[PDB]
Design an enzyme around this catalytic site. Structure first.
Site, PDB file in Angstrom:
ATOM      1  CG  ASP B 361      37.533  62.371  84.090  1.00  0.00           C
ATOM      2  OD1 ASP B 361      38.730  63.131  83.225  1.00  0.00           O
ATOM      3  OD2 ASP B 361      38.334  61.144  83.498  1.00  0.00           O
ATOM      4  CD  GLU B 364      38.488  67.247  78.450  1.00  0.00           C
ATOM      5  OE1 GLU B 364      37.374  66.571  78.039  1.00  0.00           O
ATOM      6  OE2 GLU B 364      38.799  67.384  79.038  1.00  0.00           O
ATOM      7  CG  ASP B 426      56.105  63.800  75.494  1.00  0.00           C
ATOM      8  OD1 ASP B 426      56.970  64.175  76.289  1.00  0.00           O
ATOM      9  OD2 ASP B 426      55.334  62.662  74.524  1.00  0.00           O
TER      10      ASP B 426
END
Ligand SMILES: *[C@@H]1O[C@H](CO)[C@@H](O[C@@H]2O[C@H](CO)[C@@H](O[C@@H]3O[C@H](CO[C@H]4O[C@H](CO)[C@@H](O)[C@H](O)[C@@H]4O)[C@@H](O)[C@H](O)[C@@H]3O)[C@H](O)[C@H]2NC(C)=O)[C@H](O)[C@H]1NC(C)=O
Ligand SMILES: *[C@@H]1O[C@H](CO)[C@@H](O[C@@H]2O[C@H](CO)[C@@H](O)[C@H](O)[C@H]2NC(C)=O)[C@H](O)[C@H]1NC(C)=O
Ligand SMILES: *[C@@H]1O[C@H](CO)[C@@H](O[C@@H]2O[C@H](CO)[C@@H](O)[C@H](O)[C@H]2NC(C)=O)[C@H](O)[C@H]1NC(C)=O
Ligand SMILES: *[C@@H]1O[C@H](CO)[C@@H](O[C@@H]2O[C@H](CO)[C@@H](O)[C@H](O)[C@H]2NC(C)=O)[C@H](O)[C@H]1NC(C)=O
Ligand SMILES: *[C@@H]1O[C@H](CO)[C@@H](O)[C@H](O)[C@H]1NC(C)=O
Ligand SMILES: *[C@@H]1O[C@H](CO)[C@@H](O)[C@H](O)[C@H]1NC(C)=O
Ligand SMILES: *[C@@H]1O[C@H](CO)[C@@H](O)[C@H](O)[C@H]1NC(C)=O
Ligand SMILES: *[C@@H]1O[C@H](CO)[C@@H](O)[C@H](O)[C@H]1NC(C)=O
Ligand SMILES: *[C@@H]1O[C@H](CO)[C@@H](O)[C@H](O)[C@H]1NC(C)=O
Lengths: 581, 612
Positions: B361, B364, B426
């Protein structure tokens, strides 16, 4: 540009070094004082080179330094570096915990660099210049580039100094405990180091009384807490702290505790600091910034943040009520221990104001407090300690550094000075004598230390022999009868006069070229002149007496002055001093 | 076929059409300073008079492909015009709001084109991205890997704002804007040329079962509060309702603190016994992991002293970071000691508990500090994301990651960033096909479109506690046709009909979809082609195929048209050229054709098999 005085002599010279909004405003604040306000504002560094001049011109002030000379000596080439509170113990490039942007000339010129400037200082020995720089690149200074300063010219070095100090520096209104000006302070640091424990503190207190010494107080140093950032005693090393403090009270010891602005990552208080946002932050202002100091890795408390101030103060008050601790030794405080780029609850364009905010934590415990940093901290009525001295003879934090450093700190308007530990801190590889300072260095140091505002033993006299103990008891008695009464009187005068306690010879002899140069002698007020031996294997020294009549410690009246007393006898167990007559 | 002017240039194809147009926006050229030497056209001065290294080098790599290498070096900005409505563009980054083709909404000042967590931001760029944009007119641009690349856009003039800068950015110097524009015969051939040029294909294939049997995740069902009882109850309920499993994925949080690697004994009294029971019930198991060590982890001190963490700029101390699970440091995957340390803990969980692999996980660089330092310097910060994805390599067969930065040759599954239980573009149901196709364009074949029905976040859930019954059903149906299928909120949370719909699509996935996914997965090493394909893949000259965001292919032969609107029992279905056999047995041989109001019941999906 260059400036002359009424007599016609060139007292100030400066070259523009960024190039060839600028102004020079002349001001006449008195009949005898002429000041020149100067500004250069254009994004590219501003540098002006201030020329010290023709070697008959001597300069004083600036920062406490690792290698302290008096007058100031420029060694080699130094690119301008942030003029901020740094730990100078291991650096001859950086600037020490106590500093102002103030330089004073024996020719009666002085410069105060404006507080606004993002000020960087370098120097050039070849042309004998101070390199005065403003810049916002590669620096802990934040914008809110301008180089701005005031150059003033008086009749003599003392009058122009007094004008500048009264203009820029606040005087303290209060006075530390009288006993601190007479009785020795006893510190665990150099004697025991980190390994200090409940047994060692009590053995120390016993040995102090066994050898018939008074105490201002006993200072329990690094380390008495389980981890750095915890405030209560490590129960492994201090099984019953309450009982320890009771025993110390029974033996008439007042007690202070070593504290610092850090919380290491393995302190039980680190998590509390992070979640409560009490720490200096990384630039974005969201998270604590980690810092490295000599005792490890953690965060540093934000003394611009009221929550962090109350939190720190809360723990100090608890130690006071719990253990009847009198005050604290506030260690570190230099911004060299904050990150290069940081953020705080209130923005600090000038990072050293953080050092000021730390020194404010002493205010509620001022009477027996010490700090080792000062940035416009003069109005805080506690003792200011020279950065940790080494058990060596020289100007590099050694015995010959003591008088230059004390005078420098006196120039910056801090009267209550503590010249650290008698004999130095006895650091391996930085100790003339191996384990402890050599016998002769310890004796000569003790003698100079007896004449300074506060006297602190760590390695005690009885570590040597009965003669060293006898020398200590002699200077303790001399300090009580001669020095202490004068220190207290001069301490009480500060609120009115703003004048320091320890003064250079040139204070009373401002037109005396020889007094301008002397780094081996000092005054207590205007009336006590002190000339210690500062060289090994010496039982005499040359002693300069300025104008006026001086009565020696032996009763000799010297009335043909100024005069150099050549090979003036001073035995190992003596100090040369003279009282005004 | 290039037309260079002072203030920009344009390119045409062999047929005469304008397929590329660009304006210089950090200055103009002086054309008196331009000289042509064969293929190279160089210019040495701006119109302002500034000295400049600018050139356009023409290259003919194939009979049908023409490429144009471009450089501007003196902040550099060029505006790339998408063009008239007939020109459609694909690629770039995974985004919070994913359209296909790409839609530019409003004005965006150029911002670092780096791996960000786009769960809560429509400004930032997602965990999977390349500096690659493809046109339906058979033009493509690859921005050079060297560029400290920032991307903005302008809706009014329909432009991508391509920027190089070193101020206010996580990019470090080692400003230059450099790129290659290529022009081919059609969108598919020019795409294939660009992918083969710039992106490495994976050489391995994940476990076959991951392409067939559903994955079961604790995250949306139980969240943080997951424990030993809940994992076993879940495993029991999966078998009670007669479902297969690829594996069971135990998610956040099973450790005492974030940064510890072993089970919290409060919530997992006997982990060994839990794993034994799961093995007895034929469950393979994976564990949720992350690159963080919080300040209250028993492993934080070890990380600080061993220097395993990303550092503040001076390179001396760890930099603290904030993620959704608290404050701590992040591991430096450029540091061999930090890599071995992380790998060591994963190997221990494997040998101790017979865990098959891990869900990696975060990843970024939006979770690294703005300004940081690492053991090896990263002028491009996103290479950190790449170095994190390398930690999956030893456990690739059942591994998933949610970031990709030149990570294509890592043969694990790539998960779309956490979807919401809403209908829209979205992060909702209508986002699934645009996102999967986008990630397919970037050369990642093994795509996992997150959780059936979304993550059921309060205030972002059409239906309150859990996704609406209808949203859950329609989502399950589209998810059954994607390379990997993952349940968290299970069918039996609804009713017996929803359970029956799940068993039907599980059976259909096993018999129709899975055999094709495995065959196409096995092809990747040879062809470099993705599994999930846009309609325009087989119909590259079809203007209707260029626009479709509601349909996709599995290879060239399976065409899928889910219902993506509530209260609908029909939809329009576009069939391109060729013969298509409907799921009902209808032969459509008069194509291309739009099937209007084509019936699709709540418990159905429209699909068509190639019959040409
Ligand atoms: C999976 O894909 C990865 C890329 O998507 C592969 O790694 C890349 O592979 C290429 C080819 O090996 C590398 O490009 C080369 O770099 C080497 C090494 O340069 C190093 O030294 C220079 C010093 O000048 C330094 O500047 C660099 O940053 C490196 O530290 C060069 O010598 C070659 O000439 C060539 O330019 C890429 O660097 C590399 N990229 C990344 C992000 O890793 C990977 O190998 C693939 N996996 C397999 C199994 O093949
Ligand atoms: C010393 O510093 C102060 C603060 O930088 C200067 O005073 C400011 O002058 C600027 C422009 O010269 C004005 O815009 C501010 O409003 C002034 N502030 C205050 C508090 O007066 C001062 O001019 C500097 N001295 C010199 C000689 O430059
Ligand atoms: C002690 O002196 C400090 C430093 O000069 C005083 O603090 C400054 O005071 C002025 C006048 O109020 C303020 O405008 C400055 O911003 C202060 N500077 C800093 C760094 O704090 C302080 O007020 C003095 N204390 C007392 C009791 O007068
Ligand atoms: C977005 O694009 C529009 C359209 O090109 C820009 O608006 C024009 O800007 C130019 C250059 O300053 C002016 O001469 C025109 O009069 C403007 N209006 C028009 C044509 O709409 C706008 O500058 C762009 N904005 C950003 C932020 O890139
Ligand atoms: C605490 O942390 C320091 C580093 O900051 C480490 O060297 C020390 O051994 C630790 N001590 C304890 C008591 O946890
Ligand atoms: C020690 O303390 C006593 C009591 O205050 C005092 O009278 C005496 O002068 C001191 N003696 C010293 C410092 O030698
Ligand atoms: C792409 O980057 C490399 C490395 O910086 C450079 O040598 C090359 O010239 C660049 N390509 C173009 C077209 O500028
Ligand atoms: C875990 O459970 C199994 C069976 O109940 C048993 O063999 C094992 O000893 C247990 N260990 C612990 C520490 O609970
Ligand atoms: C479950 O697994 C078996 C054996 O691995 C397989 O044959 C079957 O198709 C799978 N699917 C269902 C829906 O039972």
């Amino acid at each position: 540009f260059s400036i002359r005085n009424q007599k016609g002599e060139q007292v100030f010279r400066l070259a523009f070094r960024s190039g060839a909004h600028f102004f020079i405003q002349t001001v006449r604040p008195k009949d005898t004082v002429m000041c020149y306000r100067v500004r250069w504002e254009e994004g590219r560094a501003v540098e002006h080179a201030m020329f010290l001049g023709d070697a008959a011109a001597h300069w004083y002030g600036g920062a406490e330094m690792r290698t302290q000379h008096w007058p100031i000596r420029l060694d080699g080439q130094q690119e301008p570096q942030p003029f901020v509170t740094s730990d100078v113990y291991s650096s001859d490039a950086a600037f020490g915990g106590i500093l102002e942007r103030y330089w004073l000339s024996s020719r009666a010129a002085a410069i105060k660099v404006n507080d606004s400037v993002p000020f960087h200082l370098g120097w050039n020995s070849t042309e004998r210049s101070l390199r005065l720089q403003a810049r916002y690149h590669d620096t802990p200074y934040k914008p809110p580039p301008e180089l701005s300063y005031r150059v003033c010219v008086g009749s003599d070095v003392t009058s122009i100094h007094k004008y500048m100090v009264r203009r820029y520096f606040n005087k303290p209104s209060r006075v530390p405990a009288p006993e601190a000006f007479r009785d020795p302070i006893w510190s665990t640091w150099a004697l025991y180091g980190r390994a200090v424990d409940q047994d060692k503190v009590l053995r120390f207190a016993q040995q102090i009384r066994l050898h018939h010494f008074n105490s201002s107080h006993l200072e329990i140093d690094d380390m008495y807490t389980p981890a750095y950032g915890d405030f209560d005693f490590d129960e492994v090393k201090f099984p019953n702290a309450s009982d320890m403090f009771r025993r110390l009270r029974d033996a008439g010891f007042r007690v202070t505790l070593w504290v610092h602005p850090f919380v290491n990552y393995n302190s039980s208080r680190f998590g509390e600091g992070v979640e409560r946002e009490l720490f200096v932050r990384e630039p974005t202002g969201r998270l604590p910034a980690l810092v490295r100091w000599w005792n490890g890795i953690g965060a540093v408390l934000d003394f611009t943040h009221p929550k962090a101030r109350d939190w720190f103060q809360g723990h100090l008050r608890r130690l006071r009520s719990r253990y009847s601790v009198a005050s604290f030794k506030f260690d570190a405080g230099e911004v060299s221990y904050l990150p290069r780029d940081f953020s705080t609850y209130r923005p600090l364009p000038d990072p050293s104001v953080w050092s000021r905010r730390y020194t404010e934590m002493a205010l509620p415990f001022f009477s027996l407090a010490e700090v080792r940093v000062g940035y416009q901290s003069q109005n805080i009525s506690c003792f200011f300690r020279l950065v940790d001295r080494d058990s060596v003879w020289g100007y590099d934090l050694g015995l010959r550094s003591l008088i230059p450093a004390v005078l420098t700190v006196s120039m910056l308007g801090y009267p209550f000075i503590l010249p650290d530990m008698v004999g130095g801190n006895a650091v391996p590889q930085r100790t003339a004598g191996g384990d402890v300072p050599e016998r002769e260095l310890y004796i000569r140091w003790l003698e100079v230390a007896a004449f300074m505002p506060a006297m602190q033993f760590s390695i005690p006299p009885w570590r040597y022999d009965a003669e060293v103990v006898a020398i200590a008891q002699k200077f303790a008695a001399l300090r009580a009868s001669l020095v202490a009464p004068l220190l207290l009187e001069l301490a009480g005068e500060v609120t009115d006069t703003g004048d320091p306690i320890v003064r250079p010879l040139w204070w009373i002899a401002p037109g005396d070229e020889t007094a301008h140069r002397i780094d081996s002698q000092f005054l207590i007020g205007d009336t006590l002149l002190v000339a210690p031996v500062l060289e090994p294997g010496k039982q005499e020294r040359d002693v300069y007496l300025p104008a006026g009549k001086w009565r020696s410690y032996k009763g000799e009246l010297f009335d043909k002055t100024p005069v150099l007393l050549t090979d003036y006898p001073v035995d190992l167990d003596e100090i040369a001093y003279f009282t005004w007559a």
